[PDB]
Symmetry: C3
């Protein structure tokens, strides 16, 4: 029975999560399965998955993951992209797709 | 013998099996913990032979400490074991993991405070 | 029987790959398998395995692997070693064994 489908995002967080599209202009949208995947991934990399539960938990993860980005595989970048959106959701920063999330994260990063 | 378990000498296993995992708790360290730590090290692509010496463990802890604040329970357990393992090699008598960690940065403190 | 070996080295790079020896004065030499292995080794470490197809790709993987090298396991150093030779091949640097390859990588760094 239940797992990380309940501890990472709140109900309202969740309903905004399942409206965000994976690729800009695309058809497919984040589901619970991506959150489960990301949490199990974090522990397979020895990172604390509880950090997914808060906006700075993810801020910390993304800081630790980013230097691996250039050389990272498709798996790494998906994990990072998912955690970027989770950050957007925890911050209540409205996003339409993954791309807009990385954008807003860099804009917040420039100031 | 035992391949991964022999990082400790016969005498070191004797004090090893006396050190409590958590302070005031009664469960203690066993072979299963060293075997586990070794296997975890090579699962993080680190050389398990480093557990054989005080500075093998010194090097491992330095390589792991950056990952500690965001690390998972398995990484903190690994660090804690290697911390205790370092104190055993160093003949530093400790009673639980907390003591091992506490002395660990007394070492890491004086290293920096006479450097400065 | 799927490939993943013609993606990394060209046919002529392959002919020189297969003359490099694993160790100086040694008898054993690099083979296709060393590249298959290196490639899956990079996906298990979360790295993009396409970076092996270009010298620039390898140059970067080496940079991000070097820090782990002092405390790294036998498995890590063999990955690093294999990719160091891959680099010189891509770079048209001629080496006879893993040691020469590692040395030249050293002086570049
Ligand atoms: O993206 P919109 O142009 O805004 O239009 C709608 C809509 O938005 P409205 O609230 O204005 O009706 C719904 O979002 P919800 O009310 O359900 O929260 C939604 O409706 P249904 O899925 O129930 O049909 C659905 O898609 P989704 O929930 O998958 O985002 C869809 O968005 P799209 O127009 O992009 O399909
Ligand atoms: O004589 P030992 O066989 O070596 O056993 C004693 C002890 O009793 P004493 O007061 O007579 O010394 C405890 O036994 P327990 O009640 O806790 O169940 C304790 O035993 P533990 O091993 O379980 O802690 C401790 O044992 P040790 O230090 O070996 O871990 C210690 O042994 P030492 O006096 O030799 O240190
Ligand atoms: O045509 P061959 O005289 O038989 O030459 C080859 C070959 O040389 P070429 O393919 O270029 O002609 C290699 O030696 P090198 O050219 O690098 O010096 C080879 O060794 P490899 O397995 O690394 O290719 C080996 O010479 P060796 O006995 O040193 O291994 C071998 O000659 P043989 O097939 O007669 O052994």
């Amino acid at each position: 029975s239940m797992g990380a489908r309940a501890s990472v995002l709140s109900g309202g967080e969740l309903d905004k999560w399942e409206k965000i599209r994976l690729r800009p202009g695309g058809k497919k949208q984040y589901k619970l399965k991506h959150i489960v995947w990301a949490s199990r991934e974090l522990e397979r990399f020895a990172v604390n998955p509880g950090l997914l539960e808060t906006s700075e938990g993810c801020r910390q993860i993304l800081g630790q993951l980013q230097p691996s980005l250039q050389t990272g595989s498709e798996e790494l970048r998906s994990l990072y992209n998912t955690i970027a959106v989770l950050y957007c959701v925890h911050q209540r920063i409205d996003v339409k797709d993954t791309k807009e999330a990385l954008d807003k994260i860099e804009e917040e990063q420039n100031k």
